[PDB]
């Protein structure tokens, strides 16, 4: 069965310095999976302001702590297992 992200989106009203967290989960397709953020191109990790941790064996968490408008931007996850792939994205925007 081919996997399938369940998508998600950021809150709408993001305000400077607050915390933003999201939520990439599996609703199709069978674990293990790797799961992968990226913000337009590059991989994310966790450090600096960053958390990237995988939540259960289906879902994967981004935050974001003290968000500013350098954080402006679009965030895809991607999932992988052994039978295929699947990318979601959704834009923050702040302030």
Same mark, same amino acid.
């Given at each position: 069965?081919? +996997?399938?992200?369940?998508?998600? @989106?950021?809150? @709408?009203?993001?305000?400077? %310095?607050? &915390?933003? /967290?999201?939520?990439?989960?599996? /609703? /199709? !397709?069978? +674990? ?8 337009? %191109?590059?991989?994310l990790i966790t450090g600096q302001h960053i958390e990237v ?9 981004? %935050? ?8 402006? !931007?679009?965030? @895809?996850?991607?999932? #992988?297992? &052994?039978? %295929?792939?699947?990318?979601? #994205?959704? /834009?923050?925007?702040?302030?």
């Amino acid at each position: 069965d081919f +996997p399938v992200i369940s998508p998600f @989106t950021f809150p @709408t009203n993001v305000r400077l %310095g607050e &915390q933003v /967290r999201v939520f990439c989960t599996v /609703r /199709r !397709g069978n +674990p293990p999976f790797s799961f992968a953020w990226f913000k337009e %191109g590059e991989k994310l990790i966790t450090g600096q302001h960053i958390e990237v941790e995988n939540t259960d064996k289906y879902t994967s968490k981004l %935050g974001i702590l003290n968000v500013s408008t350098l954080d402006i !931007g679009n965030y @895809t996850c991607e999932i #992988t297992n &052994q039978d %295929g792939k699947d990318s979601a #994205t959704s /834009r923050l925007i702040v302030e």
